[PDB]
Design a protein around this ligand. Structure first.
Ligand SMILES: Nc1ncnc2c1ncn2[C@@H]1O[C@H](COP(=O)(O)OP(=O)(O)O)[C@@H](O)[C@H]1O
Lengths: 89, 306, 860, 291, 320, 49
């Protein structure tokens, strides 16, 4: 039930605060929403790379300041109960 | 807007007819044209599209001439049943019928003030009527033969009529008489105000008229003398008219050719093979680039002007 | 001419005898043979005719259904209104004219829909769709007014049409009433409706199948041959084609004149109404009609130039149209061995248009131009088809093309040995038969027994017993390169076929290599050689892809082409819009971006679109109904998934992204991916390091291919790992070298790089301790180079008299030169694996190729 | 009602009798199994018109909703219970979109009462309409429970539901699992495809219009016959109607062969047969007249 | 500059029509304009020269509204014969006739994206069309009476409508409907218009409002009064910022200035009104026609105002 | 468009008032007549006696 917009809200909160995010059991987010969230993750990491070299990234059709101290972490158990598979991108 | 000369071929051939066409004119406001006939019918066409719009029946004999009001909401038609029928372009119905002519009426024209109607019949008289009630006001005498065409001036005070008496009389509501003809004068064209400078360079108000003498000649009403003589027609001249810009002369004859003249040099530049038989009348749009010719072979054709 | 009138009018009794049976046959064909193809139509007609013959019902055997059910003037009107000259197309038009139930039209091309539009153009057609929201208004307008209606996209069928199709009509009073929904609508008599779909692979519910009649516009071999002949006439002799077209139009007009003249003559002779000699008008009209009959007699010169044109076009371009028809029907039957790639008639015609016109090095000599066109047709067809197909099936398609070339070309038909090669492996053997097992084994002995059925291989057991010294063909080495023994002079192709049969009987693991050699001997050594190099995406996108066809990019799991498309857009300086499909906002953004890119001319890329097949169908419909910019490309990134719609598969251009076959191809792909400016930076040891990285990546990926010996589980070592490895190498080289042009091999952080690969980059995926130890020992073997020692050994190719030496090059140019000149042969011992690892895999691939070819041939 | 000319034979008469007897049975629901185009809904419409029942169909379209099905069910229940009208509810299996349709149909067939169909203002409207109906009938009822009981009894007496679905083993197993009232509260009638005798009778009935008798027709000794009880020796009309029947049967066989091979298949129907015989009649008349 | 106002007398009095002129609009890129009347024709006039260029036959009944797209290469016309036609203005021929409505279609417009067409008809429904295919994709309901006019906002995300329902209803295009319902008109609502981007500052400082402090000041509608008023609205559920009483008869067309400093209005009082809306008063009154004035348009760059009327004449006013 | 002959007008039904008054509307190219809340299209060739 972690929809694309819900993950976007979590992402903008994490980016504005400057806090890490440990998403436990990411492989039950289902394929459609995993693929959708991939775009936001790519945008956040591109903004972070631009910071690495007023830095913002387009999240949920809005510009959100990205603190340099944030990171996104994914915890998975592949082959747990026939859960979802992450897309290649 | 001065180089408008008809070019081949015909744009549209309005052949939806059964009897010879006598007169054709353009609407001063709307984008339609009407056409008289020999079978007591006046038909309205759309010259932009070429589609037949409606017919106006109500005459009992052949329609001779038709003319429009200045505003374009009133149409007057004369026929061979000795009537001057009045039409409006709101509901397309007969408004009033005027009797009083002793024989076939050959011409009609709305006065530029939009209140009186002029007419010319075989009984050698010119009649003035009232558009409000159809009551005659004045009668004009001085002709002794068939009077073919009558055309007013641009102020409503000068009236020029041509007859078979080898004369073109001018009346003021007779100013002048012109008797240097050599045959029957048939049609009359008035000179607009956009030609005085052109004719002063080449040579008011001025009068131009064709005739059955295979030539066109033009006078001055202030002097009563012929200015220039335009010759070269191979048959009887039926209709003449000035160009809208007042630089060229448009005319038609029975030689099945439209010859476009000019008073700068008095020569023909291009003859147009219009119809397979005689050409009875033509008109020139005052602003649009279109020429329509009404011919006696039961066809109406519209020419593009380039 | 009465000598012909009497014969024409003296067949009344025969026609009364035959009319019942012939009407029965024609009515059965019209009612029942609509959905089927040409072969099933002919089979049904033959069965009906056989039943009538054995029931002794009289019917005319020497008749044509099209000619009986259609008039000449009617047919000429049909081909005037944009209809192909096919007999099947004429039959479909007959059904569309004499339908009783309303027709359903199936045509991927759209020619049938265009024909309907042209035919009912005197009346007013509105063209709506079943998925148009304002469809009921158009339907009720057509019902009230009396207009023909053509609705497409039957798949989203609207069941408001059920009373209209069923003719559930009320006749209260003089009016005609049909009730749809709640409204009661007066039904005009002059109302027809046509349902149209654009795919043959669609399932319709049985109620719709009952209440509609089907008209299938399938492609016929004769029609395709005619189309290809006309197109090659266009591309070779335009004046000849213009003469032929004007000739056909003139002949049709004169035949219409014949029909009109005969009708007028008969109607005048019937309506003379009295004495013909009474009035001379009849005699004069008959004289004029006889003069026109004289010009009909002098038609013979036009018939002569007809025959000369037909004979020259046949004698020149006969065996090219048949080859093209065989090519297209092979790639059409190709869809039933992997059900991923579906190829269109438009796709084949685009291939043929590419080979006809934009051929480099194609002269002005009609003798050699035909051969050049044929050879380049085969090669271009192979390239364009096998770019979107599996490397398992590359050889299958190439061998089918070889069979087509052999049938087209001299060399006799080797049908008996080809049938034994394909199907004859399953023939029943003798009961209790066992040859000598002194040098052979039982399975190859049984294979030799099966192969002995051929007349050429009459003596095989005795021959192999006598040739006891031929141990090379029995085992070891590569038997394909040197095949001893033999099956009159022997053609090279027949020798190749015989040796292929010998290899299939003896050693099935060399079947793939021998099939490659057969293809090389039949079509050329460099036939398959263009598939080793990395795919020329920039050239293919720039030239060979029309803007309205999406660039489908299917990838097996573990590979993704998104980086490839982004790199292509960056290198061509074309802005792109990458959208990851999988949300409602994703769908909305995809629609807006594709509309803006179509209007302007940018590029749009939609990723992972295999997760939305229901939206993929709508996207296919929109792309078909869309007219894009001149420079616009839509990229759809997918996976190999049986839920991808066949509609989108046919509409798009498929590029299968696959593990690169072989160490050499893997190195070439890696070096093409790594930019030259990045690899050429200071110091000079960066080239050595990048070559080592590429070799290590290729070795471990091919070991991953050879499972479970190479690795215990199938990891996914990929381009992400390679790019992270290159980044770590660059960072550590910059850390250890600050502007120095040359770095000695002792100061380079070899141990740091090795343990970083072991722990973080490549060891992240590895969970087994033994797999981690294997990765560590590969890193230790590779990343020391004995301090850049000359004549360093990367590996050993064959344990007997063979070795692999690392080149002493310094520049990326000579490194990629060495990679290119690496030998084409590969052995599992290159990776460090046992030589017997690939044997079972090659045997399984060979038997799968045999099964696929047999399935396609049997269903052909 | 409908200007569709039907053809009579033994199966049609027997099916009409069975449908009529189930309509006469109170709380009598049908379950007609048979191939599409075999004439089940038209026979049901004809029998309902004979018995005075008003045929009601769902009239499903695209973008249909379970709410729309609820509205249609509310309208038909109101007409059957409050207005005291006999309604024949024809419902094809193509009208079922999800389980929300079929669960409500199960409850309605089994009880006549669908709880939760009327809630709030709709419930108040149903109660006042039932009060008006009770006033019209003369029964005086106070409060709501016996009003609802009387409404349920009225809709039990009035409503008749007829189902029309194609035969399928897996489909029948699925329907028996997910909807027991079709197998407990509905009378089943396996119409099926038209038999060989029915096809022969239809072909003979259409053929009798047009004249094709051949006195000089030679009967072969073989005579491959596909319809039993054919008159031996057969006339020309009998021979050609047997030929038409064989044409339909060999179309069945060819379609089965294609499906077994693996190609796409299409339904072959009595509508196809009627289409074929109509084509035969029209083509025979036109060709004979023009020749 | 940003101050020119139409002044008497008119530049040209173009009188080629046959029936009352319904709607008059300008061209985006060319020095030409089109006009729709009740004789089922769309005449095209060169307003710089003043001469009739060409006509566009094809409609069966009275054409009621016309609208160009952003590129200026498409013209969408709707008529009383329940059809909507799309005109290829490059070649002056009809591309597709798009049925679907049940009554007289009252107004159409082309969205700023350029491949969607809005509609409004007497069956109280608003439909969205596809320019590329011609299909209907979305229909809007909620109005209880004849919908008279429909106008998408500046970026195409919002749609406003006016109706005989006495209400102005504005909604977002994409998924949600009925963003606001505006109910302060005591008679029929006739003519709506959005506010241009270079008007928000003047609107904010003219009406009762704080110094922003909210961000994104919100879109502003305009008028639609058959009760002889002018009313502009706000964001969210909407409030009437000002009412420009001072008009004389049924208001038929309203606009903003190009610079956003003025309100132009025309009505059945035979009068073109220039409103200085910063002071809630009309500072200029033009006796436009001899009958009811049905529509007006304002050129975005050139100084020209054009008005159509029941007088069957189209007048172009030069601005000084 | 069927002509009617409605006898017994002593018990006249006031539903015919718009029909007798010809209270019609011309939305589109057709004519609309109103009977109660129901809206019905009127055929031109209809007379009632
Ligand atoms: N006994 C019959 N005789 C003639 N035509 C029939 C007969 N039964 C059905 N039909 C045809 O079937 C059509 C209606 O089929 P329908 O009853 O809808 O099939 P189903 O009940 O399977 O849906 C009608 O148009 C009619 O022509």
């Amino acid at each position: 039930t972690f929809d694309f917009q819900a993950m976007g809200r979590i992402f903008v909160g994490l980016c504005q605060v400057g806090a890490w995010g440990c998403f436990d059991e990411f492989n039950r987010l289902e394929e459609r929403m995993l693929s959708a969230v991939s775009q936001q993750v790519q945008c956040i990491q591109e903004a972070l790379r631009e910071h690495s070299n007023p830095i913002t990234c387009e999240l949920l059709n809005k510009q959100v300041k990205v603190s340099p101290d944030m990171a996104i972490f994914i915890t998975m158990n592949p082959g747990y109960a026939g859960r979802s598979n992450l897309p290649d991108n | 807007p001065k180089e408008w000369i008809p070019r081949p071929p015909e744009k549209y051939a309005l052949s939806g007819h059964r009897s010879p066409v006598t007169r054709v004119i353009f609407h001063p406001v709307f984008s339609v044209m009407v056409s008289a006939s020999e079978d007591a019918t006046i038909k309205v066409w759309d010259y932009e599209t070429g589609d037949f719009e409606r017919t106006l029946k109500g005459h009992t004999d052949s329609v001779q001439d038709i003319s429009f009001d200045h505003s374009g909401k009133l149409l007057a038609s004369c026929s061979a049943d000795m009537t001057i029928k009045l039409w409006d372009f709101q509901g397309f119905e007969c408004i009033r019928t005027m009797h009083g002519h002793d024989h076939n009426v050959s011409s009609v024209a709305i006065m530029p003030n939009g209140d009186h109607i002029v007419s010319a019949s075989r009984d050698k008289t010119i009649k003035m009527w009232e558009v409000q009630t159809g009551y005659c006001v004045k009668t004009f005498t001085g002709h002794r033969e068939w009077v073919r065409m009558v055309r007013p001036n641009q102020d409503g005070t000068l009236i020029a009529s041509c007859s078979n008496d080898q004369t073109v009389r001018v009346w003021v509501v007779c100013k002048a008489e012109l008797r240097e003809h050599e045959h029957v004068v048939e049609c009359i064209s008035w000179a607009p105000e956009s030609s005085y400078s052109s004719i002063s360079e080449a040579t008011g108000p001025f009068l131009l008229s064709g005739s059955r003498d295979k030539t066109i000649k033009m006078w001055d009403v202030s002097t009563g003398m012929c200015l220039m003589t335009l010759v070269g027609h191979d048959n009887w001249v039926r209709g003449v008219l000035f160009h809208s810009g007042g630089k060229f002369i448009l005319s038609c004859a029975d030689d099945k050719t439209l010859r476009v003249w000019d008073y700068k040099n008095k020569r023909c530049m291009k003859t147009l093979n219009a119809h397979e038989h005689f050409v009875t009348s033509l008109d020139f749009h005052k602003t649009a680039p279109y020429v329509v010719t009404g011919s006696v072979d039961q066809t109406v054709k519209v020419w593009e002007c380039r | 001419e009465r000598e012909r009138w009497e014969k024409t009018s003296e067949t009344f009794k025969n026609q009364m005898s035959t009319i019942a049976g012939d009407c029965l046959l024609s009515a059965a064909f019209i009612a029942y043979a609509g959905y089927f193809d040409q072969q099933m139509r002919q089979n049904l007609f033959t069965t009906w005719s056989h039943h009538l013959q054995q029931a002794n019902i009289q019917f005319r055997t020497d008749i044509a259904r099209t000619e009986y059910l259609s008039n000449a003037d009617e047919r000429l009107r049909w081909q005037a209104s944009s209809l192909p000259a096919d007999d099947l197309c004429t039959e479909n038009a007959i059904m569309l004219k004499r339908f009783n139930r309303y027709p359903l039209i199936i045509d991927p091309s759209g020619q049938a829909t265009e024909f309907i539009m042209n035919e009912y153009k005197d009346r007013k057609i509105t063209r709506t769709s079943f998925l148009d929201d304002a469809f009921r208004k158009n339907l009720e307008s057509a019902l009230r007014f009396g207009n023909p209606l053509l609705v497409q996209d039957v798949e989203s069928y609207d069941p408001v049409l059920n009373p209209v199709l069923n003719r559930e009509v009320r006749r209260t009073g003089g009016r005609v009433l049909i009730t749809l929904g709640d409204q009661d609508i007066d039904l005009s008599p002059s109302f027809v409706i046509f349902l149209s779909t654009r795919d043959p692979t669609v399932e319709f519910p049985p109620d719709l199948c009952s209440r509609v009649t089907f008209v299938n516009f399938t492609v016929t071999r004769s029609s395709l041959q005619s189309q290809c002949l006309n197109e090659v006439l266009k591309a070779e002799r335009p004046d000849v084609d213009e003469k032929r077209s004007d000739l056909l139009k003139l002949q049709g007009e004169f035949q219409l004149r014949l029909r009109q003249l005969e009708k007028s003559l008969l109607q005048a002779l019937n309506e003379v109404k009295g004495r013909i000699l009474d009035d001379d008008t009849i005699i004069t009209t008959l004289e004029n009609l006889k003069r026109e009959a004289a010009e009909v007699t002098r038609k013979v010169e036009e018939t002569d130039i007809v025959m000369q044109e037909v004979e020259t076009v046949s004698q020149q371009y006969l065996p090219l149209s048949t080859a093209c028809s065989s090519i297209y029907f092979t790639m059409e039957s190709l869809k039933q061995i992997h059900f991923l790639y579906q190829y269109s008639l438009q796709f084949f015609l685009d291939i043929y248009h590419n080979v006809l016109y934009e051929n480099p090095n194609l002269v002005t000599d009609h003798t050699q131009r035909l051969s050049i066109i044929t050879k380049d047709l085969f090669q271009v067809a192979f390239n364009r088809v096998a770019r979107g197909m599996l490397h398992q099936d590359h050889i299958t398609f190439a061998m089918l093309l070889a069979r087509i070339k052999l049938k087209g070309t001299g060399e006799p038909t080797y049908d008996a040995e080809f049938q034994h090669f394909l199907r004859g492996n399953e023939i029943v053997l003798s009961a209790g038969s066992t040859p000598r097992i002194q040098g052979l084994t039982v399975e190859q002995a049984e294979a030799v027994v099966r192969l002995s059925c051929l007349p050429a291989f009459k003596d095989l057991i005795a021959k192999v017993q006598a040739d006891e010294q031929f141990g090379i063909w029995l085992d070891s080495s590569s038997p394909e390169q040197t095949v001893p023994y033999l099956w009159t002079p022997a053609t090279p192709i027949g020798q190749a076929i015989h040796r292929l049969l010998l290899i299939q009987a003896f050693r099935p693991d060399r079947l793939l290599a021998m099939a490659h050699m057969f293809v090389s001997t039949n079509l050329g050594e460099s036939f398959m050689s263009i598939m080793e190099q990395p795919l020329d995406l920039t050239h293919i996108v720039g030239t060979e892809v029309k803007p309205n066809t999406p660039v489908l990019m299917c990838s097996v799991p573990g590979y993704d082409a998104s980086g490839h498309v982004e790199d292509l857009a960056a290198e061509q300086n074309t802005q792109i819009t990458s959208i990851a499909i999988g949300s409602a906002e994703g769908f909305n953004q995809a629609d807006k971006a594709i509309n803006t890119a179509v209007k302007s001319g940018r590029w749009v890329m939609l990723k992972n679109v295999h997760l939305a097949p229901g939206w993929l169908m709508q996207l296919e419909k929109k792309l078909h109904s869309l007219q894009p910019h001149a420079c616009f490309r839509l990229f759809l990134t997918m996976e190999i998934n049986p839920k991808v719609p066949v509609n989108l598969l046919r509409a798009g251009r498929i590029f299968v992204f696959e593990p690169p076959p072989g160490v050499k191809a893997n190195m070439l792909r890696t070096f093409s991916s790594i930019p030259v400016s990045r690899i050429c930076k200071s110091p000079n040891e960066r080239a050595r390091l990048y070559f080592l990285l590429a070799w290590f990546h290729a070795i471990i990926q091919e070991r991953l291919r050879y499972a479970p010996l190479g690795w215990s589980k199938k990891y996914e070592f990929g381009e992400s790992d390679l790019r992270s490895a290159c980044d770590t190498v660059d960072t550590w080289l910059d850390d250890t070298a600050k502007g120095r042009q040359n770095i000695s091999p002792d100061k380079i952080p070899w141990s740091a790089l090795k343990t970083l690969m072991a722990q973080s980059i490549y060891g992240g995926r590895v969970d087994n301790e033994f797999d981690q130890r294997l990765l560590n020992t590969f890193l230790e073997r590779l990343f020391t180079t004995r301090s850049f020692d000359s004549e360093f050994k990367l590996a050993c190719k064959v344990d007997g008299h063979k070795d692999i030496q690392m080149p002493d090059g310094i520049r990326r140019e000579e490194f990629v030169q060495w990679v290119e000149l690496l030998p084409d042969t590969q052995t599992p011992s290159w990776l460090g694996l046992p030589n017997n690892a690939e044997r079972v895999l090659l045997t399984t691939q060979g038997v799968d190729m045999i099964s696929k070819m047999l399935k396609m041939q049997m269903l052909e | 009602e409908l200007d569709v000319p039907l053809v009579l034979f033994n199966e049609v008469l027997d099916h009409v009798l069975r449908i009529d007897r189930i309509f006469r049975q109170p709380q009598g629901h049908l379950l007609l199994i048979g191939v599409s185009g075999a004439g089940k809904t038209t026979l049901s419409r004809f029998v309902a018109w004979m018995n005075g029942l008003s045929v009601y169909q769902i009239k499903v379209h695209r973008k249909y909703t379970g709410e729309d099905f609820d509205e249609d069910l509310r309208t038909v229940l109101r007409r059957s219970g409050c207005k005291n009208e006999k309604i024949a509810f024809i419902m094809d299996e193509s009208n079922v979109l999800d389980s929300g349709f079929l669960e409500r149909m199960n409850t309605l067939l089994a009880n006549g009462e669908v709880p939760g169909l009327f809630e709030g203002d709709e419930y108040a409207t149903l109660m006042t309409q039932c009060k008006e109906g009770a006033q019209k009938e003369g029964l005086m009822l106070d409060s709501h429970e016996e009003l609802y009981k009387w409404f349920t009894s009225q809709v039990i007496r009035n409503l008749h539901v007829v189902f029309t679905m194609n035969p399928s083993s897996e489909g029948l197993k699925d329907r028996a699992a997910t909807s027991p009232a079709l197998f407990n509260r509905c009378v089943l009638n396996w119409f099926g495809d038209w038999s060989t005798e029915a096809l022969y009778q239809v072909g003979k009935e259409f053929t009798s219009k047009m004249d094709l008798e051949k006195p000089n027709y030679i009967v072969p000794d073989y005579m491959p016959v596909v319809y039993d009880k054919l008159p031996q020796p057969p006339s020309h009309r009998e021979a050609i109607v047997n030929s038409c029947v064989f044409v339909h049967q060999t179309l069945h066989q060819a379609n089965a062969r294609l499906a077994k091979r693996g190609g796409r298949t299409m339904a072959i129907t009595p509508r196809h047969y009627l289409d074929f015989i109509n084509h035969y009649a029209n083509l025979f008349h036109e060709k004979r007249s023009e020749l």
